[PDB]
Structure formats: structure tokens, C-alpha cells
Amino acid sequence: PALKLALEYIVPCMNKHGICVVDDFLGKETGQQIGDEVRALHDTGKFITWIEGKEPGCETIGLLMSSMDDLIRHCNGKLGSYKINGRTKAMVACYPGNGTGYVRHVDNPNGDGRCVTCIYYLNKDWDAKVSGGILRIFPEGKAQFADIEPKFDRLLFFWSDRRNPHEVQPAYATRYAITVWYFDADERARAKVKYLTG
Ligand SMILES: N#Cc1ccc(CNC(=O)c2ncc3nc(N4CC[C@@H](O)C4)ccc3c2O)cn1
Ligand SMILES: [Mn+2]
């Protein structure tokens, strides 16, 4: 139900707030397989990494990416004025439970093409009250900020640029999550001809 999901919620939610939470994305079963695939790769190398989506043992990881893409397609270029004509590979990251937080950062500070951050969380039965790991985002122009749990099967969207500085509180248990960044056509273009010449 991506067409309706995209147009009725994602688009207006992102255009109005610059952040959008979509719980219960792929359902429990689908998430567990992805969870297992990520764990397998972490525990032992196949042959902080980048997954194209077609690799052996990364099939359900690829499904997530296609699903994610599908939602973006069905936004039909209504996410701001962005023309999304591609994206990064999937960053499968392991975030430790060693009492370290991540310092407030902007994902895309220097206009490198990446216009939308998209994070899928893989932390089953996660309770931030015991395990921490809260994401705090500060929408630039707003009187409020948002604490967002890294809850299992949650999909989060937000603008990668200076509109969403974000920090992550410390965690006390290992965490898994998959991040993709969706490119703006004009911005990635400008960044390419900036790195060379510019
Ligand atoms: N679960 C969990 C979970 C999820 C995110 C975080 C905090 N991470 C971030 O905001 C975050 N934001 C932007 C990032 N950009 C990165 N990039 C994108 C382009 C590459 O050259 C470097 C790499 C890691 C990032 C990164 O880790 C902590 N725990
Ligand atoms: Mn970030």
C-alpha cells in the first residue's frame, strides 16, 4: 500500500515536519530474517560495510531496499522539490552498548547530494528505558525536539541537511540498523562538478 502510504503520510509529514516515523514496516517475520542476516555478517565476514542488495546472504536486506525505494518512487517527486534519481548502497552498521553516544551532527552538512536520510532499525524487544540508544533530532526552525527510540521494524525518514541536526544517547546493548541516503539529482550534480574544479 505504498502509493497511499507515501502520498497520505510520508509526503505531507516530511514536507511539514522534515521527519517521518513509519513503525511496523516489514512485519516481525521479515525483520527477523534481516536481523539474522546482519548478525551473520557481523559475527563472521561473508568473503561498517556497504551492501548493494544482491549479495549471497543479503537477500532480505535487498528486499528492504526495494521496499524503501518503492515508497520513494510512489512519493512521485513530492518530497520537497527534490528529484530523487538514485541513492547510496545500504550501510549496515553495528552500534555498541559501551555507554558511548554520537555527538550532535548533520548527516549532510556540505551539500554532497544526499537529501533524505532513511534508517531501518533491527533491535527486537528494545526498551530504551534499560538499553538507551535514543535519537534526539532538533528540527532547525522549531520550538521542539524529538526523542525517537531505535525500535524494531521502525523506518525513519528525515532531511539529511542542516534542518535535522541529531545526536544519539548512549546505549548499553549492541544495536543494528541499516541506513540509506537518497540523492537529489541537481545537488549530487553540483557536488560532482564541485569536487572536480569548483
Ligand atoms: N540503531 C542505531 C543507530 C542509528 C544511528 C546512529 C547515529 N548515526 C548517525 O546519525 C549517522 N549519521 C550519518 C552518517 N553518515 C555516514 N556517512 C554517509 C556518507 C559516508 O561518507 C559517511 C556514516 C555514518 C553515519 C551515522 O552513523 C546510532 N545508532
Ligand atoms: Mn546521523
Residue 184 labeled ligand binder: no
Q: Identify whether the C-beta of residue 178 lies closer than 8 Å to the C-beta of residue 38.
A: yes
Could you write out the three-class secondary structure of 102-119? Answer: EEEECCCCCCCCEEEEEE
The last residues before gaps in the chain (C-N over 2.5 Å) are 47
Q: For ligand 1, what atom is nearest to the CA of residue 122?
A: 1
Q: How far is the CA of 99 from the centre of ligand 1 (A)?
A: 17
Going along the chain from its start, the domains and CATH numbers come out as 2-195 (2.60.120.620)
Q: How far is the CA of 36 from the centre of ligand 1 (A)?
A: 21
Is residue 132 helix, strand or coil? strand
Tell me, using a 6 A CB cutoff, whether residue 168 lines ligand 1. yes
* Ligand at shortest distance from the CA of 102: 1
Method: X-ray
Residue 166 labeled ligand binder: yes
What gap in Å lies between CA 124 and CA 33, rounded to an integer? 12
The pairing of strands 90-95 and 175-184 is antiparallel
What gap in Å lies between CA 90 and CA 112, rounded to an integer? 17
CA 93, 22, 75: angle at the middle one, nearest 5? 100
PDB resolution in Å: 2.5
Residue 107 labeled ligand binder: yes
Tallying the residues shown for the chain, one arrives at 198
Nearest-Å Rg of the Cα atoms of the chain is 17
Angle between helices 59-75 and 27-43 (to 10 degrees): 130
Cell of 169: 544517547
What gap in Å lies between CA 86 and CA 88, rounded to an integer? 7
What gap in Å lies between CA 16 and CA 11, rounded to an integer? 8
* Ligand at shortest distance from the CA of 90: 1
Q: How far is the CA of 183 from the centre of ligand 1 (A)?
A: 16
Half-sphere exposure of 60 (CA within 13 A, CB side): 18
Amino acid in the structure at residue 32:
Q
Tell me, using a 6 A CB cutoff, whether residue 150 lines ligand 1. yes
Q: How far is the CA of 40 from the centre of ligand 2 (A)?
A: 24
